[PDB]
Amino acid sequence: KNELVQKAKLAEQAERYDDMAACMKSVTEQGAELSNEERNLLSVAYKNVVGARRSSWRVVSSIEQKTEGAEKKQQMAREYREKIETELRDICNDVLSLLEKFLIPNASQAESKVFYLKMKGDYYRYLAEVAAGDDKKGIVDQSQQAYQEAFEISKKEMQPTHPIRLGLALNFSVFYYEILNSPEKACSLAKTAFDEAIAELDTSEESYKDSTLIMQLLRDNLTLWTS
Amino acid sequence: DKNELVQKAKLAEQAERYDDMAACMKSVTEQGAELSNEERNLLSVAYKNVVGARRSSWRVVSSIEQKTEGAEKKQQMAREYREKIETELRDICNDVLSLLEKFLIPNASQAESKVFYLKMKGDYYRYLAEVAAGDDKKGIVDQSQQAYQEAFEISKKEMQPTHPIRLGLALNFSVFYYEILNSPEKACSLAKTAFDEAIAELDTESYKDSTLIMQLLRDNLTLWTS
Amino acid sequence: GXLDXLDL
Amino acid sequence: GXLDXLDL
């Protein structure tokens, strides 16, 4: 039943996000529109699951450039960087599948759709990062596709304060920069969303801190790319 | 060889993949060599993080079981998951034990190292006790006692209290007496003993790296004072 | 989570 | 390396 959820909530509490995500990967596989609670749990789980590997790959990758003494460790560094890359892709695709298969086509709430699509973008963007060879150009535009579809839905049936829309914005704003390498497009979008989210200064309904927490990231991103 | 997995593990640390890191050190031990200081530490860092994760995972799940007990329809799934971790830790503990009891203490050439790996026995068996259910614990507790005491004989009147490995033993054996044997009186004894002797020592990374160990003893002594 | 559930 | 090596 929701025995898995319970396992997940424990796996979350246990920081055993690997299990957690598998639990929710199954809840998804159950073929139901996960409750915003469940939703959040699935994300939380996979957030750390993909996050673990990104932050792994990231350090290895940078150490790939900073090889022990000479460039002889390159072989090992790479070999292992690839060992991570393998895993990361599995997790990404796994998430991506869930999105293609269950999440996106099940999500009834417009807000939810944005979220999953953002995941799509997010997780596709996680591929681009690793996507050396000739794959990127396509995969980056496959991430873009996903982010844009999300943006379309966000700027439609989502108020400018909505943390998901802002969550999308930031996630998509970082995409244009880090991935597409087009600050011009990146900075604007970020501004746009944040700039648009400012007018709503809630003189008495808002999204409290969650929404504001993003603005700070947004502007803190904006100011980084500013330089 | 051994180095062919000393770089990889070093990178696994870098990449926070201690499960890999541990698995590299296992092979480095399986190489058949008295581990270096670099290579020993790594094994610890690796496995300490592996067990640590489980131990800290178990602690929170066990803690969650403090909502419904051995016989319930709400804290029955916790115990079953806690048991899954119990298993995981056991396997990881036994693995470290297999490495330690097979060729970790007998291969060790140095004297100061003997203490160390035995301190692991006193650590890793203690971990087992925490999770050791039923009546089996009793013996497993003795395992840690026989170990952490055995390492105390090699570290006692053998290395200066200044030694961080002798003091690290103090910490862990004390926390064994307190946390496992629940014998605070004896725990505080050992602690004072170590700390006291450690005061009458003089050392010019022993400056800080051996000072924090002491600071914990004092903290524990204080905790167990109240 | 704010950014944890949004993955930022 | 110094605290985690010796496990507290």
Numbering used by the authors:
A (entry chain A): 3 to 205, 207 to 230
B (entry chain B): 2 to 205, 209 to 230
C (entry chain C), D (entry chain D): 421 to 428
From the paper:
Macrocyclic peptide 1 34 binds to a class of highly related eukaryotic adaptor proteins called 14-3-3. It was originally derived from the pathogenic protein ExoS and proves efficient in inhibiting the interaction between ExoS and 14-3-3 proteins. The ExoS/14-3-3-interaction plays a crucial role in Pseudomonas aeruginosa infections which play an important role in hospital-acquired infections. Here, we present the structure-based design of peptide macrocycles targeting the protein interaction site of human adaptor protein 14-3-3.
To investigate the binding mode of a truncated peptide in more detail, we aimed for a crystal structure of high affinity binder 11 (Et/Me) in complex with its target protein 14-3-3. The crystal structure harbors one 14-3-3 dimer in the asymmetric unit with each of the binding grooves occupied by 11 (Et/Me). The two ligands show a close overlay (RMSD = 1.1 Å) in particular for the backbone and LDL-side chains (aa 7–9). The additional ethyl group at amino acid X3 in 11 (Et/Me) points towards cavity 1 thereby filling some of the partially unoccupied space observed for peptide 1. Overall, the crystal structure verifies the anticipated binding mode of 11 and the initial motivation to vary the size of the α-methyl group. In addition, we were able to obtain a crystal structure of high affinity ligand 11 (Et/Me) in complex with 14-3-3 verifying the anticipated interaction site and binding mode. This is an important finding as it supports the relevance of the conformational restrains applied during FEP.
